Design a protein around this ligand. Structure first.
Ligand SMILES: [Cl-]
Ligand SMILES: [Cl-]
Ligand SMILES: [Cl-]
Length: 278
């Protein structure tokens, strides 16, 4: 019940866009989990206090626990992470607004800095489709069961399952294992796969076991299922020079048309919490 355990959600509110999907997803989640909503506008110039008060009043009348703030220091991603630290939020929800209408799935450079440094789960909303009744896709690699991958996969499945339940949606899993006596090593992999299926109670129809590059297999499955949310984890160990997202998550985040919930390994979250608390 990973989502039920999140007791406050940071909702990034845009002042000038015609969609408000960050708050719509926050209302759906908190309507079930009774989580607190902290609404943040990141801007220095205009005084948004009256509009934030009116929005908070309307949500409290609907039964939500709500606080609001307007802040600005240095950059958009730094303002968001500083607010997450001040309010102790366990999830950040932000809507994706692409810089180029001909490259609509590409995240902005500031979105990438938010995903790199956030010391908590980040939900990047990329579609206006409602979650209710849709398909939720979890991305794992059943071919690896070391302590670090077991923990990360358990978190990806816990969050994806809680989302499927609160949205009255169906849950699907994509396992993309790199292409490789070949029949015997395949037995160890088939063993890992059958154990994963029993441990997590997945039907054959829910579990997509595919061989090939994860960076293209994850988006293909999301597109074929018309998934509305994809849950992914960043790489178990950082690459050189602080490259902690990893190539698979970099490509998938810039390609998916679904919303994306980005989780990080516990050891990476702990180090990012230290950096954010400086
Ligand atoms: Cl407030
Ligand atoms: Cl929704
Ligand atoms: Cl990175």
């Amino acid at each position: 019940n990973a989502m039920q355990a999140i007791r406050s959600i940071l909702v990034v509110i845009e002042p000038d866009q015609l969609e408000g999907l960050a708050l719509k997803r926050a209302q759906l989640i908190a309507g079930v989990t009774q989580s607190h909503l902290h609404l943040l506008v990141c801007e220095k110039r205009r005084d948004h206090s009256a509009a934030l008060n009116d929005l908070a009043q309307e949500l409290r009348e609907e039964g939500y626990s709500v606080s609001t703030n307007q802040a600005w220091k240095d950059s958009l991603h730094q303002t968001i992470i500083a607010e997450q630290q001040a309010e102790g939020c366990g999830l950040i929800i932000k809507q994706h607004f692409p810089d180029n209408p001909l490259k609509k799935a590409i995240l902005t450079p500031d979105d990438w800095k938010l995903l790199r440094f956030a010391p908590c789960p980040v939900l990047m909303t990329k579609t206006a489709r409602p979650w209710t009744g849709g398909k939720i896709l979890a991305a794992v690699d059943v071919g690896n069961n070391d302590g670090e991958h077991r923990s990360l996969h358990a978190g990806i499945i816990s969050h994806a399952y809680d989302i499927a339940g609160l949205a009255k949606a169906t849950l699907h899993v994509i396992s993309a294992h790199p292409s490789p006596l070949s029949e015997t090593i395949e037995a160890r992999y088939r063993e890992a796969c059958r154990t994963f299926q029993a441990e997590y109670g997945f039907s054959d129809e829910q579990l997509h076991i595919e061989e090939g590059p994860a960076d293209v297999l994850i988006p293909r499955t999301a597109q074929k299922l018309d998934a509305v949310v994809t849950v992914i984890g960043t790489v178990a160990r950082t690459g050189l020079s602080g490259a902690l997202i990893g190539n698979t998550a970099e490509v998938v985040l810039d390609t998916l048309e679904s919303d994306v919930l980005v989780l990080k390994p516990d050891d990476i979250i702990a180090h990012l919490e230290e950096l954010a608390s400086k």
